[PDB]
């Protein structure tokens, strides 16, 4: 089975980000400045998957995965004497790591990159801050 | 050396087994003060409220851990660093830190405990008695005590609507003799009740609650006890009343219903009828004090009662004034009552207590320092009464250490003052003509 298909990743972004945490005032906790490097790596990898095949793109995917697992644990926002870790909850709710595990060829890799684009797009839709 | 370095509150019990708190203040040089808070009321629109936990698992919702934490976490950080002799500054800082008129955020118990502990620590640092520190060098007057001896109303199943009956030994030469007279009258009444077959166990304030036939029966038995001890009613010992008339007041019909406590056949009295009844009681018996003779909202009734009886009988507003400077000022302007009952926990701070006492004194009123139903081993109200030269105290009966501690402190103060010590007695009722 697979968690990302071409018919549902957009709608999956809806359920991934609608359940993200929020401050008491209602604004979001994640900001674009925390997921900037992840989006840059995903965009570059999607860009290179068009011309270069997958047998030498495995290391870039492993770098993207270790970067996800780093930025999830590193970033933290402390509000009202309460610490929160927004990138980790984005990865947890959006199943980013599990999608990264199923990347085996060009098509699934491009689907994962488009899923990341959907996630950031819809995060900007509901008032995300840069 | 006098800089406060530690403020610590802990939850203790009171005289009724219900939780209260005590605060300890330590200064730099080692001066120590401990203030315990009598239990008051956590509800009330125009009086300071106390902070209770409300957790029904612990103490039936009467725990004071919340207010203890408010002292240990909020008040302690602000107060530590002040000079211990800056009583007014510390009190105003606590009032500003609370921010509410009723002191409901921090709790009036918390603020009062810190206030008492700071005053006692300053007195300990100065190596002076507490009354000397509070009232200055001119502290000489020993209060005339109103000793509760018989309880009715809500504190007894007898058909009596008056909550408390008291003896006032205003004919004594000294306070020591007044205390001896009160104890001997207490024991004579105990013997009379034992012969009569009535119950002799004491209540919250140390007095008896027998099953009398009525108010007249209780007053006559009190007079019999006074005469059995060898003292003259109306010359040596007088009688005070705490009607607590707000309890049996039918506010909807603007009438005083004695049927609530005195049975189905009890008389029904309007404001004028209630004034007439109080006047008849004053004429029949040596009654020198009537407390809460009208409802806390019957201002016209209070004005009429003061116009009729105020020239010869002390009229005290307990629920009428609620230790409120605003209510006391309104009563002074409208000639309602001629005395105020002063409870330190109903206002929450020693500075405001002394402000209310000064306002009452400047208008010809007498300020009566009082106790609450649940007291402690803290006997600060005796030092408050002597320090203000108030001349009257109401600290219960002669039978429990929650009451006896204040009398013992007054005995200690009188022994310290020596020849300087004064007991006015009947002259402490300066609000009355002649």
């Amino acid at each position: 089975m697979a968690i990302l298909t071409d018919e549902n990743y957009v709608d999956k972004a809806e359920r991934a980000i609608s359940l993200l945490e929020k401050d008491n005032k209602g604004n979001y906790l994640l900001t674009t400045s925390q997921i900037r490097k992840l989006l840059s790596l995903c965009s570059s990898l999607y860009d290179r998957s068009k011309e270069r095949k997958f047998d030498e793109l495995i290391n870039d995917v492993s770098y993207l995965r270790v970067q996800f697992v780093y930025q999830s644990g590193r970033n933290s926002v402390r509000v009202n004497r309460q610490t929160f870790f927004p990138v980790k909850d984005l990865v947890e709710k959006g199943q980013i790591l599990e999608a990264l595990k199923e990347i085996k060829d060009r098509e699934t890799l491009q689907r994962f990159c488009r899923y990341m684009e959907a996630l950031v797009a819809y995060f900007k839709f509901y008032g995300g801050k840069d | 050396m006098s800089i406060i370095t530690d403020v610590y509150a802990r939850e203790v019990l009171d005289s009724r087994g219900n939780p209260t708190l005590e605060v300890e203040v330590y200064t730099e040089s080692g001066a120590f003060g401990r203030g315990m808070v009598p239990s008051g009321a956590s509800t009330g629109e125009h009086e300071a409220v106390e902070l209770r936990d409300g957790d029904k698992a612990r103490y039936g919702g009467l725990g004071t851990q919340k207010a203890v934490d408010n002292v240990n976490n909020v008040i302690a950080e602000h107060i530590i660093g002040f000079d211990v002799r800056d009583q007014q500054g510390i009190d105003r800082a606590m009032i500003a830190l609370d921010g509410t008129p009723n002191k409901g955020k921090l709790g009036a118990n918390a603020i009062l405990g810190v206030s008492i502990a700071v005053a006692r620590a300053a007195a300990d640092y100065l190596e002076v008695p507490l009354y000397s520190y509070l009232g200055g060098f001119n502290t000489k007057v020993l209060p005339t005590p109103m000793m509760n001896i018989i309880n009715g109303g809500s504190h007894s199943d007898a058909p009596i609507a008056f909550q408390e009956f008291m003896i006032v030994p205003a004919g004594a030469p000294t306070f020591k003799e007044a205390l001896r007279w009160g104890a001997e009258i207490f024991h004579a009444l105990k013997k009379i009740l034992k012969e009569r077959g009535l119950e002799t166990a004491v209540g919250d304030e140390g007095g008896f609650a027998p099953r009398f036939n009525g108010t007249e029966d209780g007053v006559e038995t009190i007079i019999k006890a006074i005469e059995a001890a060898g003292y003259v009613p109306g010359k040596d010992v007088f009688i005070g009343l705490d009607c607590a008339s707000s309890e049996f007041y039918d506010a909807e019909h603007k009438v005083y219903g004695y049927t609530k406590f005195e049975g189905e056949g009890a008389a029904v009295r309007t404001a004028a009828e209630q004034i007439d009844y109080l006047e008849e009681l004053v004429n029949k018996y040596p009654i020198i004090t009537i407390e809460d003779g009208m409802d806390e909202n019957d201002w016209d009734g209070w004005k009429a009662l003061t116009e009729r009886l105020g020239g010869k009988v002390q009229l005290v507003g307990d629920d009428f004034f609620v230790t409120n400077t605003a209510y006391l000022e309104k009563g002074i302007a409208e000639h309602a009552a001629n005395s105020i009952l002063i409870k330190v926990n109903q206002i929450g701070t020693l500075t405001e207590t002394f402000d209310a006492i000064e306002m009452a004194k400047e208008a010809g009123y007498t300020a009566v320092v009082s106790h609450r139903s649940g007291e402690t081993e803290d006997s600060t109200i005796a030092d408050i009464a002597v320090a203000t030269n108030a001349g009257q105290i109401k600290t219960g009966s002669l039978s429990r250490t929650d009451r006896i501690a204040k009398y013992n402190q007054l005995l200690r103060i009188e022994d310290q003052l020596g020849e300087v010590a004064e007991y006015r007695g009947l002259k402490s009722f300066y609000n009355l003509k002649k």
């Binding site: - | 800089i3 909020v74 950080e77 921010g99 955020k105």
Partner: protein
Amino acid sequence: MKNFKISSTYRAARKQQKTANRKSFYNDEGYMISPSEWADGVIKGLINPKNSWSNDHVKGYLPRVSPRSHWTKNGYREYLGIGKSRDIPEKEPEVIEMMDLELV
């Protein structure tokens, strides 16, 4: 801080300049707030009561701190910040550079 203590002169200056009677209060973000909202926030747990206030300012450039003392094995007094310490200093790092046009 164990090597030092608060000096007696600074403590006296803080005492009767009365700087503790003019405390300022801050929230969790370090913004100045009135004592009422400070108490509110501390009660609700949105402010740490320990590190959230300041004792105004002591005027006069006084040294805040004096050396703290202790007892040696001889029973003598000694400053806490002096002693065997360690021994690693080298000499210097002479970097030559005998060509830099030094401005007058």
